Nucleic acid binder design. Structure first.
Lengths: 82, 95, 106, 96, 468, 95, 79, 105, 91
DNA sequence: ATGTATATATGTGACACGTGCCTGGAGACTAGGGAGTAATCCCCTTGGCGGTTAAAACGCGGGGGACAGCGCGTACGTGCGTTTAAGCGGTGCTAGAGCTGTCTACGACCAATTGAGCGGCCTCGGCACCGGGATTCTCCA
DNA sequence: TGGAGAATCCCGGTGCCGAGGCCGCTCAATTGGTCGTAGACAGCTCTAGCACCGCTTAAACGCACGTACGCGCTGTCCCCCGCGTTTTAACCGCCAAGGGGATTACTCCCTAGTCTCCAGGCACGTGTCACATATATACAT
């Protein structure tokens, strides 16, 4: 009565992301590695985001926490306020 | 009808000039909630946080795919293999 | 009447707000006389160069308004700014168009 | 009735420098945020570098030479040499 | 003719209201009686020589029904239905409107979804004389503001037909009146004048002698609203039993085990370590309602492939389910037909599993199927040789208005917060033409959370005396 | 006498267990003085600065050679080419 | 020449420390160029640090801080 | 009088951590138990590093710690390898590793 | 005069291993490591205090700094020992 | 089978104890101002429904890369003999790195004004679609 | 080179909404006095890099030589690509109520100063040890 949430990243989305990066042909065994790497990256960001949220005695995650968490990893993101 | 290899270049030329979102928002905010459920219980998320997370994830994935493409071109090939991704992550020090 | 510290120096950025931000951050015990003027001059020069690049990029594509695409094009087409902003990703920016010579049909 | 807390932004100054540079070019509302973030990031890097340099050399004051060396360190290539010349010209006019 | 004396009086009332040039709201209870009277009123305003066009806005499920009515009333009267897929929409945009001035103009029937998506086109090229609604239940929370855009162009006359305008929520008369007569805006901005202490009272009959200004406010409340609202009665059976059930000790143990919400530490050892918990409960009332209805609904914590406990012991968890089983085994000797009304499809799945074990075959409308409804009703139901006896329905979904009404007994498992949903549930439950007594039943639990909900719902319903 | 390929492995096993300096000190401090002559005139150098510079340079070169070796093994080869070094520097972002 | 002072056996030993079996004869120029570029990039910051403090001698702390700026922390010498 | 480190049971000094925090002007005011916490964390890290280094030096039949044993202890642990990935130790050397392709067969 | 942690490192080493000595070249590395960890922790705590508009450094800020800087299982084991020291100091 | 890499006996420059002095951590009075507490109010949340329209799934043929085996050539690893410069010890020499001592001048702090910058509304020109209409792009021939 | 079906910008209208421009406060930005301590300048002392010469002895260079691996070729197979049907979920609205963080008011107790003072941290002298040179066994061609 449910679907897995990691299967929600479908094959055409990964194909479009590869075509944005300039790839001609794509094999049929790279979707699992892409999902695993996306999962690991999201875990590593969300750990710091939840730590920042929990420091300030809050229960809601704001955009500034995500911006500071991305800044800790060296990937500065512009447009949202930091 | 068309010979293989033309639609791929047309998609490459079309997707590299548009500024949009390629991953759907709703399954991504469910993957984000289900990943955050493991660490703290009963969290809440603003929309800008998940949009920023989506932007960062797409940028990271496009960079990884460009590095993987360069690694695959280095070995005189056109296709993409998982070992190219593993080599790129090993050289970049992510692993 | 009184004159501002930015009008006499010829700058366009404010000077008392740079002093206010430096004092509010407690970077040291004491400040100097012409340090905010220097910082404002550097920031104004950088902003002027970035706006020159962005305006040239937007004017090249037959447009009369600057969007983040033109900002990304101006940043990614310069060596100095590319070295300065290598690890920065811009929201709604896109990707610089580049196609390898091997993939091209012959 | 206060709508919201006041926010300090460089919108009007960026608009003035843009009108000085190009006479007939406008700017969208989405690029001003990016420009503000860029200016604040450069400001925070320069201030942090100057503070750390002041801490290292056992000196309790921030002078123009510390920010001179901070500009020489942070800004790479030809941008460092062209930023020093404009900044020194402003300090001379302020003192005299 | 087909119409009776009362219909003629309604027509004369519409003509007399148009004689004063005032836009109209009508709240007739009989659904079919409104549309034929409105069609006759338009036909009276069409044959007189007026050349104004007409717009009808109805839900999509009855538009072809309107196409029947113009077929049933007069074949010389034609109309268009502006409902189609995108490719033929631009084909039919100019098909029957060649010019703003001409001898013949069509009368146009649209939908809510047409008037909300890509609705700018209608105003841009053409004005319309009469605008008519057919439901009137979609203009309360002031979310659809395109009616303001329609108001920007001069709509001369608006008619709003409502089934029941009284849901007893705040400012429904405000919202409805401001669409029909926006002229008085500041008058209603303060509701204190209409409001009285009689509204807030704990009496069962809701009449207090000690309170003051009740009679004057009630008299003025029906008096001012009387010219705006016409409510017509057909004249100028039904038996509802609410049966309560006793709470078992195991479900009560869950109740005072989750008041302090110590479920995580108790079932942490039972669950496999390293799997984790799905999540701490967020809201109190909805979870309390699920717990009161059945604890098995709360089993989202555990994981199994449709793995449900044995049917023999499933009875023990609830007294409501046991009482329903006793009522159903008492009702098999009556040789009658039952309907089961519920609000959540997970309960409609637990029930389905239970009667898939009991061995009786059932018929169900859940809303997962599209256009299979009619086939479901025709096959294994509404037949003399049909062996199905149990019919599962959700109150929020849509069932066909069957005249036959082969099912005479209706069972409500859980109660609704707004009694109008129960009113339409009874409307489907029993209809004209059957003399059979309708023994409606309700399964409730005493001294629980839903008793407060039922009391508030009946207090919500009890304001039908003050409007006419 | 010996078959080719044994002395290379013996050198690999011997050089990976010793902690010494492989580059000579005196030509390195002359390369350092001649590189520093271009920027400021009449500089002076302590010995610890040039020793630290030598240590950093050797560590950087060994890391680059390990990355180049991994890139060369990825393409089913035993030899080392300049294009492997260029690929490793392009992936690492040094270029 | 001072760039020829980095001889072939030293580069071979540095490659054997990194675990390389066979070595071609065209990688010495790229190695010398990369070493030159790295030394230039470190010595620029080192000389800037030395010139900030109104001195004329380069100490080890300047080199340690210059390496710290590039992200390569070096232990043993005092920082 | 008793020291602030004897009562807490620590081995690192407490008034020098306060002196270094005050001399660096990290903020306007400090707390009561922050130097104790910092000293405890530093003592734990030092204890773990010295445990790893002593085990590595005792494994090679030696009775004295040299930087080689420090490098061996750092590079053979995942946690310290993640902590000190970008750090190079003087007179440390290189971890022995030979690829399987280069091995003769 | 130079401030170094030589005697304290020697005391903790003698507490850990009873019959192991240390050379003079490893003490410099250990001092550099301790000073680097101290500077990272202090900088992180100062930046966190600056971000949240708070003028004081408390034990919770350094708690979160330890949770951020130290990765993996080391973060969870450093918090338990540090909290035990603070409890004994207050009481 | 025959020529090279790992285990045991006797001699030597840095470490674990001891003396000495000397600025700082700790015990004690007194301010003060920042970290702790209840009232409004507007966005999430939970289980459902209706309805539309692009998007994803499945299947099927097909042609064009991936891959393995094979052969040739020719650059790189190994060994021996000849220069050569680095490592070392010892000496002479002078710029410059710290290290005190004294003056003076420019930032910190506090009263006292006052005119720019941040909110709110008017008023429209560059940018987003529809709809032809030339203009080329690849796939046969 | 020549057709032929098919993408693809160019030139027009047609609106229309965020950018550019008006008020009304209000609060930090800028003057004037006054104090006080850090930076600038001047000397003074010791030390440690910069030349410089003779010895000598490992190591770099040069040159044969011979062989193993890298690169180009051919044949086969099998696996992604492109196009056409066919379901299906995202997107958008709409109940029905609560609740929970984003914001605003008021008290007390933990931290900053000043003022003293004495065991615990850094400089100078002793006993006592983990690597250098000589004799004995286990593997590759």
């Amino acid at each position: 009565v449910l679907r897995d949430n990691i299967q929600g990243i479908t094959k055409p989305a990964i194909r479009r992301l590869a075509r944005r990066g300039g790839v001609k042909r794509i094999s049929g065994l790279i979707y699992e590695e892409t999902r695993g790497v996306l999962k690991v990256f999201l875990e590593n960001v969300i750990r710091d985001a939840v730590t920042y949220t929990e420091h300030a005695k809050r229960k809601t995650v704001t955009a500034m926490d995500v911006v500071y968490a991305l800044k800790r990893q060296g990937r500065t993101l512009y447009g949202f306020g930091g | 009808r068309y010979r293989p290899g033309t639609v791929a270049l047309r998609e490459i030329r079309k997707y590299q000039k548009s500024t949009e979102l390629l991953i759907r928002k709703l399954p991504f905010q469910r993957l984000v909630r289900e990943i955050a459920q493991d660490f703290k219980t009963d969290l809440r998320f603003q929309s800008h946080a998940v949009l920023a997370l989506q932007e960062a994830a797409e940028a990271y994935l496009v960079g990884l795919f460009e590095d993987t493409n360069l690694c695959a071109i280095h070995a005189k090939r056109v296709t993409i293999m998982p070992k190219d991704i593993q080599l790129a992550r090993r050289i970049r020090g992510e692993r | 009447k009184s004159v501002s510290k930015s009008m006499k120096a010829g700058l366009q950025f404010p000077v008392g707000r740079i002093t206010r931000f430096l004092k509010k951050g407690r970077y040291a015990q004491r400040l100097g006389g012409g340090a905010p003027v220097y910082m404002a001059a550097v920031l104004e020069y950088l902003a002027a160069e970035v706006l020159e690049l962005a305006g040239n990029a937007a004017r090249d594509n037959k447009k009369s308004r600057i969007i983040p695409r033109h900002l990304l094009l101006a940043i990614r087409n310069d060596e100095e700014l590319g070295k300065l902003l290598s690890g920065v990703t811009i929201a709604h920016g896109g990707v610089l168009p580049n196609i390898n010579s091997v993939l091209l049909p012959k | 009735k206060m709508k919201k807390k006041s926010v300090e932004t460089y919108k009007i100054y960026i608009f003035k420098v843009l009108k000085q540079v190009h006479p007939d070019i406008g700017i969208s509302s989405k690029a001003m945020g990016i420009m503000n973030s860029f200016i604040n990031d450069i400001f925070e890097k320069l201030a942090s570098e100057s503070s750390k340099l002041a801490r290292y050399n056992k000196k309790p004051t921030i002078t123009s030479r510390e920010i001179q060396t901070a500009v020489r360190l942070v800004l790479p290539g030809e941008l460092a040499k062209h930023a020093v010349s404009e900044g020194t010209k402003a300090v001379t006019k302020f003192t005299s | 003719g087909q119409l009776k004396s009362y219909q003629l009086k309604g027509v004369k009332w519409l003509i007399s209201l148009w004689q004063n040039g005032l836009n109209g709201i009508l709240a007739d209870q009989m659904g079919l009686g409104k549309t034929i009277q409105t069609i006759g009123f338009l036909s009276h305003l069409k044959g007189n020589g007026l050349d104004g066009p007409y717009l009808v806005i109805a839900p999509l499920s009855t538009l072809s029904n309107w196409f029947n009515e113009i077929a049933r009333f007069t074949p010389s009267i034609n109309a268009i239905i502006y409902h189609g897929d995108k490719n033929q929409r631009d084909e039919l945009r100019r098909k029957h409107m060649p010019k703003t001035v001409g001898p013949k103009f069509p009368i146009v029937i649209t939908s809510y979804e047409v008037a909300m998506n890509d609705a700018k086109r209608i105003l841009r090229h053409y004005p319309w004389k009469y605008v008519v609604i057919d439901e009137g239940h979609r203009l309360k929370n002031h979310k659809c503001k395109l009616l303001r855009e329609l108001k920007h162009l001069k709509m001369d006359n608006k008619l709003l037909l409502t089934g029941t305008p009284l849901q007893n929520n705040l400012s429904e008369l405000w919202s409805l009146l401001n669409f029909i007569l926006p002229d008085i805006f500041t008058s209603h901005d303060e509701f204190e004048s209409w409001f009285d202490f009689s509204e807030k009272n704990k009496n069962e009959a809701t009449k207090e002698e000690e309170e003051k200004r009740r009679a004057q406010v009630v008299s003025k409340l029906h008096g001012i609203l009387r010219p705006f609202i016409l409510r017509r009665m057909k004249c100028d059976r039904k038996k509802e039993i609410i049966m309560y059930a006793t709470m078992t000790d195991h479900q009560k143990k869950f109740q005072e085990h989750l008041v302090n919400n110590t479920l995580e530490a108790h079932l942490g050892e039972n669950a496999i370590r390293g799997q984790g918990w799905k999540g701490k409960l967020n809201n109190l009332v909805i979870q309390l309602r699920k717990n009161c209805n059945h604890p098995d609904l709360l089993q989202g914590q555990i994981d199994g492939s449709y793995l449900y406990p044995p049917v023999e012991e499933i009875v023990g968890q609830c007294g409501k389910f046991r009482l329903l089983e006793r009522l159903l085994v008492r009702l098999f000797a009556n040789n009658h037909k039952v309907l089961i009304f519920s609000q959540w499809t997970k309960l409609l799945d637990i029930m389905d599993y239970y009667f898939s074990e009991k061995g009786f075959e059932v018929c169900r409308i859940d809303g997962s199927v599209k256009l299979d409804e009619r086939r479901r009703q025709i096959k294994d139901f509404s037949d003399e040789k049909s062996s199905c006896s149990i019919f599962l329905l959700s109150t929020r979904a849509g069932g066909l208005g069957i005249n036959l009404t082969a099912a005479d007994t209706c069972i409500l498992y859980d109660s609704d917060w707004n009694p109008q949903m129960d009113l339409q549930a009874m409307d489907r439950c029993h209809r004209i033409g059957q003399t059979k007594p309708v023994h409606v039943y309700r399964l409730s639990t005493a001294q629980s959370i839903e008793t407060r909900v039922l009391k508030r719902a009946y207090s919500k319903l009890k304001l039908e005396h003050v409007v006419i």
